[PDB]
């Protein structure tokens, strides 16, 4: 004979998705980290011996939920900033006079008094101006003007991706896989539970992962289906590859007041010589890094000639490497970093030509556009390349070789490299089991 | 000698007023995608021996639904191109009546350059700046509110919406056959929340609503009072078909950076007045039964119908939203009959199209319905009427029933008549012979 | 030996700030009192003794919460009004047919977007600046957009109660002559503070709470040379004000149905606005203030000067009389000196201002529409916001000047007898109790 007995506070859980709130280390930040609740100074991490749980990062809701949250943050930050609606005016632009990617645009902008106009000479990057009449010239309309209104990014706020800890509410937990070499999906043996994720820097990058988490002791390749050519392939590096970026153009910012008390920032003049922006990366490190990736890529799908090409072709935002450091938005051509072949057998830097874009659409949205104000002085940016976003275009049966093209055209993939170790679980404190007991009456 | 015991989870309630959330089974003005998906199985519990009292007039959920509908209408219009720039001098000429070929110049994306356009605006949406003088017309409601265009994608389709109360509350449903609106419902049933209610907006005639069970029923808080609306519900629907013959070719232009504006560019074929059809035999018989039942509440006086009261178009005409366009039909052809105790074929109702509207009668907001391309046809069912007796005089044998009401709440009151929200009181007390041991 | 025990409901509390919500007396008011929850018809003035809890108005967070809350209500009640963006147009002005009024003319958009109407309105010189050296420009046009205050809502301060959520109580200090930072006895407890009027004033408290039977001086550091010194009067010194100009308001339709108001003409001669106060009461009040001030510090030689200098906002009085805003020069109320030994009305000249930023915010500007006809507003002076200017060591005297430049001090003088605490009724204590099994 047996009787059912209920247990409260039982240590069991179930897969689930829920609303998540941040937590930042202790106003003028794009992610509103100051308004975010302060993080817990004690990282309460509890290990789970003998616990084996399966993780499916490609089917979770954390990245999908974080994607919407980040978009709402980017926008809630641009909401109170100056609206450059009056900037959509015909711009008479001419070749910059002091390599051909900057144009000297002269336009009539509104002034505080609605019945007066000010002529202002600004220098805009060609990538942000489109010819009004293709046949003629000296008539360039601001890009994104025929799709949505432009919204100036506030200059006092910073776009730096400081770490943010995504934490669950009370009664919920976030598991943390710690098995070394754990790929995208699998049964994690070294499972552990923490109050919430570590500092996840919300870096906005495309075609490459910057300042992200590194591997433990070996290269890790994660994907929901490696054989599927249409699926994204994320590679995590064990040894970071430092990349240095710089904008030699010593732009001189100038300010003008448009409308009632709304300032507009632009590039007045370039002091000294004008030189294109670029990024330096040690050839030995990158060349040696791909040697390991090619060696590891040859493991999942067998020994075949690994080849890397220069993107798949298309628009700048999806065929070039994006940046968000130094208050600027670079668009680097990574053709030099994926121009090598690797067989079974097998000063000193690689220069990446980069173009700067002011009017941008980071979330691939056509209903909203943002104008990044220029930053005075020669901006420098150094970061660590810790992950790569690869895609195999082997639509035709690969016989001896297949080309790997970096990209993905999706923003959710980059953040997946930082949340692959987690999975939200709803703890069920109630449990029932048979027992040899009967309550009194 | 009797002690007292306290009960928990007792089955009782009390009339209350609480916030109600919506529910539906992105592309609609009601924004039901954000609502909680309704449970497919309707949880209905029948109550035996219950004769709960009902009163739809003092019911508060009708006001809440009216307020929420206003919020969704404004929330849906909030992220849309603001036609504020259309407050320019309009030069219009007769079409090559109810339509005018208006011409003017408007701001293009680049503020520096303008663009000349030729749009066809209905006379109801255009008023003359110069009294009497020709030309120089301006867009109506430009002197009272900012015109806002409806995002072309979001459709005005009145899909069903379920009004559900949070936990701890309940909505009582009256199942009595032919309920008279107010009284003690002898057939009550508890449901977690109301059924799918179509929020179709209309006045002077209820469409696509619920039909009666077995006979026509009349509802009124005070039927003898002239100032109180008389909501009538039919048992058999009277199909009504409408159509605006104009092919209505639509044209689009970009005003300001990114915002687009749609308008009627040209009309292919002959221009014809919009109208609605109703079978004469069916409608004529409906008035017979309506007058037959109306004689029960009043004496044996003869019942006659008039052609509304007269005045503004928004209240004195049957206004319905179908096929993405708003019509304003002259219902004078329906209410033009007299009845006594003794006792090819379609009645045509002239209608006028209108783009600039103030659906909720608010002067602070204005709606601009974009023209729908191609001819549009609409087929709906008439399930109720809004009547108001003009008995301001001491009539002895006559009883004039003029369609009207003018209150938008009346539309939803005709459907929410069988619902009443009550807060659950799970705590009760009663005497009992017991002693709490130490 | 003894065993621990736990008691639920214990009458204890802990100092901790919490979110506060309003409560008004039971839509058309700037403070949105009707939209606010109603106040308790009978507040519980529960008596307590032997508590001797300490208070500190310069450290509590409730005063700061009110400052941010009041600003929110101002924006909440101001954003639905018409935005006067088209008013930022070049103004052509000439002297009124009197140096403080300028007969300005300009183009203003009518109901149509392509039609402008030439209007004639009178703008005070304080809200006008040259665009070059006749064309004049509206002030604050280069700082923020102007917004009109809807006449449907009045600026008259009405009492509003600030109540805590369930589980948090607001203590009420009632010690006689409560100076501030220290120990307070007779501390009563109520669900929430009484009705407090959110009056907007500068360097002089109006319609505030008076002292029980003696003047009170308070400050976070009375000995500091840069800390505000609030003073609470024992009896109120009534002050009268008036605008002799008989203004005639004219309205014009602008934009998509938006309305606008302005000064059309003046009936009769133009005379500068001013405020009166009985010299006998003011002299007696300041005479007694020196007596109470002599006990704190100084070489028994009190000196009063006419402010310390700066812009109009911090160097002059502020009012919100019947919708209009005044700015009076207080040089006449602080032009006296005294020692240990020791018609009939003092007048204060004032200048009317329409464009204002009462909250010292440069991101938003409010345009108060002119109220038609002459308007008067009698008020009671209940406190003073003074600060010592002892830049040199206290040898024989010290100078006291009105000011502060901080709007929080206006509320600190009213919320001085309140402190929010968190009720933590779950407590433990040794006992001989035993848990049966």
């Amino acid at each position, epitope marked *: 004979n047996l009787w059912v007995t209920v247990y409260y506070g039982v240590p069991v859980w179930r897969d689930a998705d829920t609303t998540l709130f941040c937590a930042s280390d202790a106003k003028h930040n794009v992610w509103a980290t100051h308004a975010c609740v302060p993080t817990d100074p004690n990282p309460q991490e509890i290990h789970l011996d003998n616990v084996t749980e399966k993780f499916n990062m490609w089917k979770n809701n954390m990245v999908e939920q974080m994607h919407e949250d980040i978009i709402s943050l980017w926008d809630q930050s641009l909401k109170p900033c100056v609206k450059l609606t009056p900037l959509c005016v015909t711009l008479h632009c001419t070749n910059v006079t002091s390599r051909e990617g900057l144009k000297n645009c002269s336009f009539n902008m509104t002034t505080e008094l609605r019945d007066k106009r000010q002529k202002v000479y600004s220098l805009f990057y060609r990538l942000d101006i489109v010819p009004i*009449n293709e046949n003629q010239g000296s008539e360039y309309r601001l890009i994104n003007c025929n799709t949505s209104a432009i919204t100036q990014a506030c200059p006092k706020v910073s776009f730096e991706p400081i770490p943010i800890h995504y934490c669950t509410p009370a009664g919920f937990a976030i598991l943390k896989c710690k098995d070394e070499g754990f790929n995208g999906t699998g049964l994690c043996k070294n499972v552990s539970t923490v109050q919430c994720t570590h500092g996840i820097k919300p870096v906005v990058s495309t075609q490459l992962l910057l300042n992200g988490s590194l591997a433990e002791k070996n290269i890790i390749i994660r994907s929901e289906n490696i054989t599927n050519n249409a699926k994204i392939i994320i590679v995590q590096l064990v040894q970071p590859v430092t990349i240095k970026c710089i904008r030699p153009n010593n732009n001189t910012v100038k300010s003008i007041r448009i409308g009632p008390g709304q300032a507009f920032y632009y590039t007045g003049d370039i002091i000294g010589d004008i030189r294109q922006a670029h990024c330096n990366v040690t050839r030995s490190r990158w060349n040696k890094t791909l040697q390991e990736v090619a060696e590891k890529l040859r493991t999942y799908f067998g020994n075949k000639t690994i080849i890397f090409a220069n993107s798949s072709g298309g628009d700048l935002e999806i065929t070039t490497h994006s940046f968000n450091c130094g208050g600027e938005f670079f668009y680097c051509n990574t053709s030099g970093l994926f121009n090598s072949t690797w067989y079974v057998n097998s000063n000193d830097t690689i220069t990446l030509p980069c173009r700067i874009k002011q009017i941008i659409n980071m979330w691939q949205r056509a209903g909203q556009a943002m104008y990044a104000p220029p930053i005075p002085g020669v901006i420098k940016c150094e970061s660590n390349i810790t992950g790569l976003l690869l895609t195999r275009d082997g639509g035709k049966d690969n016989n001896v070789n297949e080309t790997f093209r970096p990209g993905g055209s999706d923003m959710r993939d980059n953040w997946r490299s930082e949340l692959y170790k987690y999975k939200v679980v709803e703890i069920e404190p109630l449990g029932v089991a048979p027992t040899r007991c009967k309550r009194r009456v | 000698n009797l002690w007292v015991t306290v009960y928990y989870g007792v089955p009782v309630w009390r009339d209350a007023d609480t916030t109600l959330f919506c529910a539906s089974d992105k592309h609609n003005v009601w924004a039901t995608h954000a609502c909680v998906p309704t449970d497919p199985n309707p949880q209905e519990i029948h109550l035996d021996n219950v004769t709960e009292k009902f009163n739809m007039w003092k019911n508060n959920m009708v006001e809440q639904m009216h307020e929420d509908i206003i919020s969704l209408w404004d929330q849906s219009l909030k992220p849309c191109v603001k036609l504020t720039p259309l407050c320019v001098t309009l030069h219009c000429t007769n079409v090559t009546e109810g339509l005018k070929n208006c011409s003017f110049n408007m701001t293009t994306e680049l*503020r520096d*350059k303008r663009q000349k356009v030729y749009s066809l605006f209905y006379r109801l949406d255009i008023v003359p700046i110069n009294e009497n003088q020709g030309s120089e017309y301006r867009l109506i409601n430009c002197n009272t509110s900012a015109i806002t265009q409806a995002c072309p994608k979001v459709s005005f389709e009145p899909i069903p919406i379920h009004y559900c109360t949070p936990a701890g509350f309940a909505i009582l449903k009256c199942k009595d056959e032919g309920f008279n609106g107010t009284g003690l419902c002898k057939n009550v049933s508890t449901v977690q929340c109301t059924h799918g209610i179509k929020p179709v907006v209309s006045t002077q005639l209820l469409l696509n609503g619920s039909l009666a069970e077995k006979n026509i029923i009349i509802r009124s808080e005070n039927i003898t009072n002239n100032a109180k609306i008389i909501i009538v519900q039919l048992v058999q629907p009277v199909t009504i078909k409408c159509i605006r013959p104009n092919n209505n070719t639509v044209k689009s232009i970009r005003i300001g950076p990114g915002q687009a504006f749609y308008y009627t560019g040209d009309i292919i074929g002959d221009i014809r007045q919009a109208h609605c059809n109703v079978t004469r035999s069916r409608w004529n018989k409906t008035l017979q039964e309506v007058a037959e039942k109306l004689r029960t509440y009043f004496g044996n006086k003869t019942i006659i119908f008039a052609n509304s009261s007269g005045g503004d178009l928004e209240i004195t005409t049957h206004s319905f939203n179908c096929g993405g366009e708003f019509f304003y039909c002259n219902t004078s052809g329906l209410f033009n009959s007299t009845w006594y105790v003794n006792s090819n074929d379609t009645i045509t109702l002239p209608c006028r199209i209108k783009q600039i509207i103030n659906m909720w009668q608010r002067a602070g907001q204005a709606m601009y319905a974009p023209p729908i391309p191609g001819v549009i046809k609409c087929e709906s069912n008439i399930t109720g009427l809004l009547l108001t007796r003009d008995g301001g005089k001491d009539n002895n044998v006559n009883e004039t029933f003029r369609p009207g009401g003018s209150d938008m709440r009346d539309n939803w009151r005709s459907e929410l008549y069988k619902y009443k929200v009550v807060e659950i009181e799970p705590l009760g007390v009663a005497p009992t012979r017991c002693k709490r041991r130490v | 030996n003894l065993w621990v025990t736990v008691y639920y409901g214990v009458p204890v509390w802990r100092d901790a700030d919490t979110t506060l919500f309003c409560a008004s007396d039971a839509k058309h008011n700037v403070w949105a009192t009707h939209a606010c929850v109603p106040t308790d018809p009978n507040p519980q003035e529960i008596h307590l003794d032997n508590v001797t809890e300490k208070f500190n108005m310069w450290k509590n967070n409730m005063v700061e919460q009110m400052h941010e809350d009041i600003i929110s209500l101002w924006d909440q009640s101001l954003k639905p009004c018409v935005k006067l963006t088209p008013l930022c147009v070049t103004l052509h002005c000439t002297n009124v047919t009197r140096e403080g009024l300028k007969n300005c003319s300009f183009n203003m958009t009518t109901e149509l977007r392509d039609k402008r109407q030439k209007v004639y309105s009178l703008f005070y010189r304080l809200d006008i600046v040259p665009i070059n050296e006749s064309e004049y420009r509206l002030i604050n046009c280069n700082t923020s957009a102007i917004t009109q205050a809807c006449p449907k809502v009045s600026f008259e301060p009405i009492p509003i109660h600030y109540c805590t959520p369930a589980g948090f109580a607001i203590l009420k200090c009632k010690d006689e002559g409560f100076n501030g930072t220290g120990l307070c006895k007779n501390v009563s407890t109520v669900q929430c503070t009484h009705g407090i009027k959110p009056v907007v004033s500068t360097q002089l408290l109006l319609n505030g709470s008076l002292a029980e039977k003696n003047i009170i001086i308070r400050s976070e550091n009375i000995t500091n040379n840069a800390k505000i010194i609030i003073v609470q009067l024992v009896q109120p010194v009534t002050i009268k004000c008036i605008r002799p100009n008989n203004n005639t308001v004219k309205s014009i339709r602008i934009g998509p149905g938006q309305a606008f108001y302005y000064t059309g003409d003046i009936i009769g001669d133009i005379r500068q606005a001013h405020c009166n106060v009985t010299r006998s009461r003011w002299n007696k009040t300041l005479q007694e203030v020196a007596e109470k001030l002599r006990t704190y510090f100084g070489n028994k030689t009190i000196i009063f000067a006419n402010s310390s200098g700066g812009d109009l906002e911090i160097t002059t009085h502020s009012f919100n009389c019947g919708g209009e805003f005044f700015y009076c020069n207080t040089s006449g109320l602080f032009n006296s000196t005294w020692y240990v030994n020791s018609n009939d009305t003092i007048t204060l000249p004032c200048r009317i201002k329409q464009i204002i930023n009462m909250w010292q915010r440069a991101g938003q500007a409010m345009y108060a529409p002119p109220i038609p006809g002459v308007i008067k507003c009698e008020s009671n002076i209940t406190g003073l916001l003074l600060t010592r200017d002892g830049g040199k060591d206290n040898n024989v005297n010290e100078t006291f000047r009105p000011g502060g430049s901080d709007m929080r001090d206006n509320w600190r003088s009213e919320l001085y007898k309140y402190k929010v605490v968190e009720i933590e009724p779950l407590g433990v204590a040794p006992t001989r109790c035993k848990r049966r099994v």
Partner: antibody
Amino acid sequence: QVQLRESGPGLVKPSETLSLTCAVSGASISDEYYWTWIRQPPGRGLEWIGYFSGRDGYPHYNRFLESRVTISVDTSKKQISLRLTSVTAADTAVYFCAKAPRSFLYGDDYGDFYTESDYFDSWGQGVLVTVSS
Amino acid sequence: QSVLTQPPSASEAARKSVTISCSGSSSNIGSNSVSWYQQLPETAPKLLIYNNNQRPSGVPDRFSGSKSGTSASLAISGLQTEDEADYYCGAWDGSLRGNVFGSGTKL
């Protein structure tokens, strides 16, 4: 300084379309100006025909001639064209291609407003147009 | 056709201050600029006064303009022999949606 110069057939038969052009020099054709066409019959008063905004890029014509004239401009070679359909003997006149400045009147959040064609700064040399068998 | 009106001819000797008048209605004269023009024989015209009384570059102070309600006039003084030409007044007509000129006053 801006130079205008007409060019077209001096003699045209009745009932067909009259096509003539006027070159532009010294200023870009797409500049902030109103390229207006004017005509003056022999010893009669001066009357307006239509204009083509260089910046707005749209034409406008007189209501009495709106159903007969169509103005077009070629930005490639900087020249405006006047095409008067169904010419008659009453249309004999010296056509002048004058420019009017699209001066800025006052701005607005949704767009700027400008003056209409008035106070022509420059006029063309003038082309004599006769119509008869 | 010319909606405005002015005397067909005001010819007379020189050395005085003749003043040619131009009138219209609220549609054209009483609503915008009242620019004037001069037309020498067998040649295109030229601008003399734009807006209301503002003079262009190259024209001497001899020529002046004025506006008064729905009327107008061109003021000149110290005339010479080269002034023998046809003068035209102009304004933008709101009702006609097009600028119109006067009948032409021959001096």
